[PDB]
Design a protein around this motif. Structure first.
Motif, PDB file in Angstrom:
ATOM      1  N   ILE A 162       8.199   3.541 -13.352  1.00 37.83           N
ATOM      2  CA  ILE A 162       7.918   4.103 -12.053  1.00 37.83           C
ATOM      3  C   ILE A 162       6.730   5.073 -12.132  1.00 37.83           C
ATOM      4  O   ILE A 162       5.749   4.901 -11.415  1.00 37.83           O
ATOM      5  N   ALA A 163       6.814   6.071 -13.013  1.00 39.39           N
ATOM      6  CA  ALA A 163       5.806   7.126 -13.056  1.00 39.39           C
ATOM      7  C   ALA A 163       4.424   6.605 -13.387  1.00 39.39           C
ATOM      8  O   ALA A 163       3.423   7.059 -12.846  1.00 39.39           O
ATOM      9  N   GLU A 164       4.376   5.619 -14.249  1.00 38.93           N
ATOM     10  CA  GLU A 164       3.107   5.075 -14.622  1.00 38.93           C
ATOM     11  C   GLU A 164       2.558   4.215 -13.506  1.00 38.93           C
ATOM     12  O   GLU A 164       1.367   4.178 -13.275  1.00 38.93           O
ATOM     13  N   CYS A 165       3.454   3.559 -12.781  1.00 38.37           N
ATOM     14  CA  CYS A 165       3.076   2.815 -11.596  1.00 38.37           C
ATOM     15  C   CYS A 165       2.438   3.745 -10.577  1.00 38.37           C
ATOM     16  O   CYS A 165       1.348   3.487 -10.079  1.00 38.37           O
ATOM     17  N   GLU A 166       3.126   4.828 -10.262  1.00 35.18           N
ATOM     18  CA  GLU A 166       2.630   5.767  -9.269  1.00 35.18           C
ATOM     19  C   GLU A 166       1.193   6.155  -9.586  1.00 35.18           C
ATOM     20  O   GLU A 166       0.299   6.073  -8.724  1.00 35.18           O
ATOM     21  N   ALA A 167       0.989   6.554 -10.840  1.00 34.66           N
ATOM     22  CA  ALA A 167      -0.311   6.970 -11.329  1.00 34.66           C
ATOM     23  C   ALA A 167      -1.332   5.849 -11.217  1.00 34.66           C
ATOM     24  O   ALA A 167      -2.424   6.050 -10.697  1.00 34.66           O
ATOM     25  N   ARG A 168      -0.984   4.668 -11.707  1.00 34.70           N
ATOM     26  CA  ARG A 168      -1.907   3.533 -11.646  1.00 34.70           C
ATOM     27  C   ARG A 168      -2.330   3.216 -10.217  1.00 34.70           C
ATOM     28  O   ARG A 168      -3.500   2.968  -9.947  1.00 34.70           O
ATOM     29  N   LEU A 169      -1.381   3.258  -9.296  1.00 35.82           N
ATOM     30  CA  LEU A 169      -1.661   2.880  -7.933  1.00 35.82           C
ATOM     31  C   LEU A 169      -2.461   3.954  -7.221  1.00 35.82           C
ATOM     32  O   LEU A 169      -3.354   3.640  -6.426  1.00 35.82           O
ATOM     33  N   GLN A 201      -4.792   5.813  -8.353  1.00 37.03           N
ATOM     34  CA  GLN A 201      -6.198   5.600  -8.716  1.00 37.03           C
ATOM     35  C   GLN A 201      -6.806   4.592  -7.768  1.00 37.03           C
ATOM     36  O   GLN A 201      -7.997   4.624  -7.523  1.00 37.03           O
ATOM     37  N   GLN A 202      -5.978   3.661  -7.298  1.00 36.15           N
ATOM     38  CA  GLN A 202      -6.413   2.600  -6.399  1.00 36.15           C
ATOM     39  C   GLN A 202      -6.231   2.994  -4.948  1.00 36.15           C
ATOM     40  O   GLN A 202      -6.358   2.144  -4.094  1.00 36.15           O
ATOM     41  N   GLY A 203      -5.880   4.244  -4.654  1.00 38.65           N
ATOM     42  CA  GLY A 203      -5.636   4.674  -3.269  1.00 38.65           C
ATOM     43  C   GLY A 203      -4.268   4.326  -2.661  1.00 38.65           C
ATOM     44  O   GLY A 203      -3.977   4.731  -1.541  1.00 38.65           O
ATOM     45  N   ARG A 204      -3.417   3.598  -3.396  1.00 37.70           N
ATOM     46  CA  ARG A 204      -2.111   3.193  -2.903  1.00 37.70           C
ATOM     47  C   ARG A 204      -1.092   4.249  -3.297  1.00 37.70           C
ATOM     48  O   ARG A 204      -1.259   4.948  -4.299  1.00 37.70           O
ATOM     49  N   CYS A 260       6.108   3.122   4.840  1.00 36.63           N
ATOM     50  CA  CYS A 260       6.174   2.272   3.667  1.00 36.63           C
ATOM     51  C   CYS A 260       6.196   0.824   4.035  1.00 36.63           C
ATOM     52  O   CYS A 260       6.768   0.475   5.043  1.00 36.63           O
ATOM     53  N   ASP A 261       5.548  -0.007   3.223  1.00 33.46           N
ATOM     54  CA  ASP A 261       5.564  -1.470   3.437  1.00 33.46           C
ATOM     55  C   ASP A 261       6.251  -2.247   2.305  1.00 33.46           C
ATOM     56  O   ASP A 261       6.085  -3.471   2.180  1.00 33.46           O
ATOM     57  N   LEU A 262       7.015  -1.509   1.491  1.00 37.00           N
ATOM     58  CA  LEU A 262       7.831  -2.075   0.434  1.00 37.00           C
ATOM     59  C   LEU A 262       8.791  -1.010  -0.103  1.00 37.00           C
ATOM     60  O   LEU A 262       8.404   0.149  -0.301  1.00 37.00           O
ATOM     61  N   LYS A 293       0.800  -1.231   0.000  1.00 38.11           N
ATOM     62  CA  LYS A 293       0.000   0.000   0.000  1.00 38.11           C
ATOM     63  C   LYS A 293       0.833   1.282   0.000  1.00 38.11           C
ATOM     64  O   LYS A 293       0.324   2.362  -0.319  1.00 38.11           O
ATOM     65  N   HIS A 294       2.104   1.189   0.363  1.00 42.02           N
ATOM     66  CA  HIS A 294       2.947   2.374   0.380  1.00 42.02           C
ATOM     67  C   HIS A 294       4.346   1.995  -0.019  1.00 42.02           C
ATOM     68  O   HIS A 294       5.105   1.399   0.767  1.00 42.02           O
TER      69      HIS A 294
END
Ligand code: NA
Ligand SMILES: [Zn+2]
Length: 266
Positions: free
Chosen positions: A85-92, A94-97, A206-208, A15-16
């Motif tokens: 990375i940047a696309e990950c940030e954006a995708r996540l 949207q999911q609240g992560r 952070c959890d990862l 989640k973070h």
């Protein structure tokens, strides 16, 4: 271990995420660092010029250097790791992560890739600081000031511009008119503590943790990653530093960030 499936399982629950990025990431985009044995700029290496002493002593020269470095950035682009990375940030998001980037790099490539929650712990080629009032202002002007136009050539036989200090970039608040310096952390300067206290907050959440284009055991990645791993949070390194078998961390994926990281994050 190099079992990806395992890493992905963690990625799925996380989640973070905090992503610490070091020089290997900018290297893969072709950014000169002026460290290595052939990495000269005119007669000098970075450690000669990136210091307050150099700047106090010869602001023209130091400015010529940083001008050059600002200008080569118009031809180096984000690589697939930056983007993944940047696309990950954006995708996540949207999911609240959450996804954050703690970078040693000063080239603004994460920003150009579309990353948003970025902490530039060594500052940036494209910010200034007023030697006088300390205002920190964003600047992408090319050239940063007229005096520097066409200056900064890298071949050793280039003639010093020796720009009078009155004409180097000045702070535009006319009450001040102070001399500007690049808001980068030079050799022998501490990090900004407001930033460290934020990063700390982030890393506690952070959890990862991903370490990209560097190893967790090298300064300054070592400030962050061990802290997280000692709380039992997984840490994944992506680098091609060839880190010896015996002290890679939790998960390692040897190879170019541009190749390894994007499949990791899809
Ligand atoms: Na500050
Ligand atoms: Zn000022």
């Amino acid at each position: 271990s190099s079992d990806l499936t395992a890493f992905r399982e963690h990625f799925a629950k996380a989640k973070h995420i905090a992503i610490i990025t070091g020089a290997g990431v900018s290297a893969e985009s072709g950014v000169p660092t002026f460290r290595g044995p052939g990495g000269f700029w005119r007669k000098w290496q970075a450690q000669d010029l990136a210091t307050p002493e150099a700047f106090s002593r010869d602001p023209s020269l130091v400015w010529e250097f940083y001008h050059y470095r600002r200008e080569v950035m118009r031809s180096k682009m984000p690589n697939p790791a930056h983007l993944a990375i940047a696309e990950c940030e954006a995708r996540l998001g949207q999911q609240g992560r959450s996804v954050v980037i703690i970078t040693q790099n000063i080239d603004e490539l994460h920003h150009r890739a579309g990353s948003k929650h970025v902490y530039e712990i060594h500052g940036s080629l494209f910010k200034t600081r007023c030697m006088s009032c300390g205002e920190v202002k964003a600047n992408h002007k090319s050239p940063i000031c007229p005096a520097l136009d066409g200056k900064g050539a890298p071949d050793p036989n280039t003639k010093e511009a020796r720009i009078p200090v009155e004409l180097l970039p000045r702070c535009e608040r006319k009450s001040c008119n102070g001399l500007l310096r690049p808001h980068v952390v030079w050799f022998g300067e501490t990090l900004d503590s407001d930033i460290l206290t934020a990063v700390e907050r982030e890393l506690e959440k952070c959890d990862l943790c991903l370490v990209v284009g560097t190893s967790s055991i090298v300064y300054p990645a070592a400030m962050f990653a061990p802290q997280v791993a000692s709380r039992g949070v997984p840490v994944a390194e992506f680098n091609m530093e060839c880190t010896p078998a015996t002290q890679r961390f939790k998960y390692h994926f040897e190879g170019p960030c541009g190749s390894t990281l994007p499949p990791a994050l899809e």
